[PDB]
Design a protein around this ligand. Structure first.
Ligand SMILES: CO[C@@H]1O[C@H](CS[C@@H]2O[C@H](CO)[C@@H](O)[C@H](O)[C@H]2O)[C@@H](O)[C@H](O)[C@H]1O
Ligand code: NAG
Ligand code: NAG
Ligand code: NAG
Length: 606
């Protein structure tokens, strides 16, 4: 179609499959293996990207151009890498990925949404879709085209450090929340074939259903461990939301570090090729987790030659190396040259990668849109996060006896009130893991409103608000307070650091609640990624709210405390009486919860 130097794959009017096949046919082995290689920005340079024909870059947790970087700085970084990739012989644009898992959370000033467990409490898939939409905008504000979300793990044991990344222990709730996908990517057309990838265009991002499969089913909630369950159970609990993801055109699937009945997912041909590709008809690309192929072996990295063979033969398409790319490319090249990995396998991997790139418009818009920068931290998105935080809250108790006046909602006008606890004025703590840093952090790490700040913004001007992080009993009794709001809970964590066999909150937390509630009527706000031992907190408190990890918009909490809205959240997980009961999930034989899945008290708006 019509100039003399015409190249079909560069023609935006041509069908995606025609463009894919036209480009594939022109590629060298080096160019093909390059496409299959994803590297950290930390090891990327223009020469590296060009010389190795690199297909993808990522920012892992906390991998940022600098602390406090603006949206424009991110765009300029991504564009710099893209300019190198576009300078190769074939000019294949790279795709840049990041964990935008509760907003564009590595980025300073990005709206931080509640983590997934709290989103499960909302039972509101349309809310989650709108969060996906807002997240896509804030990711594109930074020039990034690809989000490693949603985590559709079904966490079956809250001792797991990623339980907060799971919408629920109930697969039906996880299935419902796959609405994140068309939020991130755009809605698929009416004709759409389940398993095809889809992204609407330059204001949307490629999504990633992760981590395939059974990441939430590991023994004792040990992160990356073995999931011991028969096929029927894997298919009934851990797999269903992957089919919903196929139906919604999820562009990519990331493989789990975990094993199923002793077989590493990163080496499981039956599940990756036999099931995901051949049965579910997935036609996007399958990506490893970071050093996932290394961890096939024990010790990890002890036979990288085998790691490459096993993973690529299993059906993985793109390898999140993410650092030692030279070794990866060299070994894979050697395996192909020696006939150990057939060219058909390479061509399939590259077909899938290119399919996603062409489909999403990446060849047409390889560079960032500077007009999108202002989407970052946009007030409308914060208003959405505030709605989500409020809807996520689960009221567990509202009065010590059935005959007491209900404490909540609290009055906005009172002479003097107390706000207390380690989590009352700590933005990092209310965001939890995957916020600015990989593991999260403490204090004022980004733009947001803490619980204290939200209280001050809510109350009548005549209301005096006193803050004390850890007041003693005498301070509270002598203070002339009308009531107190006390916020305590878990510190930020991610992945194995969050694995926890005792699930008791750090001190001081309970001691502060006891001191405050002993002196004045108190509403306890519990910040956690999961159910934790809660009977002692309940015994002390007039009212208690499970607020999960509500994100940057602390006014979501006070919107419910002061009755602007009624409490509506319902537990998306079983609340255990004791960790000795675990695992214990709804539908089990000996089900003996402190609070069952679905429990939640309500209030009416005042
Ligand atoms: C300890 O090394 C750090 O690990 C984290 C998490 S591993 C892996 O990372 C993927 C890409 O960021 C996530 O999509 C996936 O869910 C995680 O399991 C990694 O983010 C850091 O880059 C790395 O320093
Ligand atoms: C399949 C798997 O990951 N199994 C691991 C095992 O290798 C390790 O010794 C144990 C204790 O850390 O945790 C589990
Ligand atoms: C009272 C108690 O057991 N606390 C421990 C804590 O020291 C540890 O950091 C955490 C991580 O697993 O587990 C819990
Ligand atoms: C404390 C309170 O107002 N509770 C009410 C409940 O009695 C009523 O049935 C419902 C619908 O009006 O709203 C809520």
């Amino acid at each position: 179609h019509h100039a003399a130097d015409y190249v079909l794959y560069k023609d935006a009017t041509k069908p995606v499959e025609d463009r894919v096949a036209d480009l594939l046919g022109r590629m060298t082995l080096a160019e093909k293996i390059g496409q299959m290689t994803q590297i950290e920005r930390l090891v990327a340079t223009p020469d590296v990207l060009r010389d190795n024909f690199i297909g993808s870059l990522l920012s892992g947790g906390g991998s940022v151009p600098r602390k406090g970087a603006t949206a424009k700085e991110w765009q300029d970084m991504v564009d710099g890498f893209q300019k190198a990739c576009m300078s190769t012989r074939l000019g294949i644009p790279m795709i840049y990925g990041i964990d935008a898992v509760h907003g564009q959370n590595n980025v300073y000033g990005a709206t931080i949404f509640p983590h997934n467990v709290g989103l499960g409490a909302t039972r509101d898939p349309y809310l989650v879709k709108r969060i996906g939409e807002a997240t896509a905008l804030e990711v594109r504000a930074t020039g990034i085209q690809y989000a490693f979300a949603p985590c559709i793990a079904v966490c079956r044991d809250p001792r797991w450090g990623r339980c907060y990344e799971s919408y629920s222990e109930d697969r039906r709730i996880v299935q419902s929340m796959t609405e994140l996908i068309p939020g991130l990517q755009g809605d698929v057309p009416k004709d759409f074939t389940s398993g095809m990838p889809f992204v609407a265009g330059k204001n949307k991002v490629a999504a990633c259903a992760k981590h395939f499969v059974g990441d939430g089913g590991t023994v004792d909630g040990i992160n990356e461990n073995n999931t011991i369950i028969n096929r029927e159970g894997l298919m009934n609990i851990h797999m269903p939301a992957y089919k919903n993801a196929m139906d919604k055109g999820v562009s990519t699937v990331m493989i789990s570090y975990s094993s199923w009945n002793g077989v590493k997912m990163h080496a499981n041909q039956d599940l990756v090729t036999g099931y995901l590709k051949d049965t579910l008809k997935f036609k996007g690309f399958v990506i490893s987790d970071a050093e996932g192929i290394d961890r096939i072996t024990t010790p990890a990295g002890s036979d990288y030659s085998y790691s490459v063979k096993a993973s690529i033969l299993a059906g993985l398409d793109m390898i999140m190396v993410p650092n030692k790319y030279q070794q990866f490319i060299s070994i894979l090249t050697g395996h192909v040259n020696g006939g150990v990995i057939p060219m058909s396998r390479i061509d399939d991997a590259v077909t899938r990668i290119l399919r996603v790139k062409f489909t999403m418009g990446l060849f047409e818009n390889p560079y960032a849109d500077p007009a999108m920068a202002e989407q970052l931290g946009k007030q409308e998105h914060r208003d959405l996060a505030r709605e989500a935080a409020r809807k996520s809250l689960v009221l567990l108790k509202n009065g010590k006896t059935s005959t007491d006046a209900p404490l909540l909602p609290l009055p906005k006008k009172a002479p003097k009130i107390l706000v207390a606890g380690s989590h009352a004025d700590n933005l990092g703590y209310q965001c939890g893991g995957w916020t600015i840093e990989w593991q999260g952090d403490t204090g004022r790490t980004t733009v947001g409103t803490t619980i204290l700040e939200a209280v001050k913004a809510a109350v009548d001007p005549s209301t005096v608000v006193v803050f004390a992080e850890n007041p003693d009993a005498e301070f509270v009794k002598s203070g002339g307070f009308s009531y107190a709001i006390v916020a305590v809970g878990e510190h930020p964590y991610t992945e194995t650091k969050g694995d926890n066999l005792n699930l008791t909150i750090p001190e001081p937390g309970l001691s502060t609640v006891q001191a405050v509630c002993g002196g004045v009527r108190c509403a306890t706000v519990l910040i956690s990624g999961r159910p934790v031992v809660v009977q002692p907190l309940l015994a002390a408190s007039d009212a208690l709210v499970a607020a999960w990890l509500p994100g940057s918009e602390g006014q979501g909490v006070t919107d419910a405390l002061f009755g602007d809205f009624g409490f509506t959240g319902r537990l998306p997980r079983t609340w255990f009486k004791s960790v000795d009961q675990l695992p214990m999930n709804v539908g089990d034989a000996h089900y003996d919860p402190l609070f069952r899945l679905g429990y939640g008290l309500t209030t009416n708006a005042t």
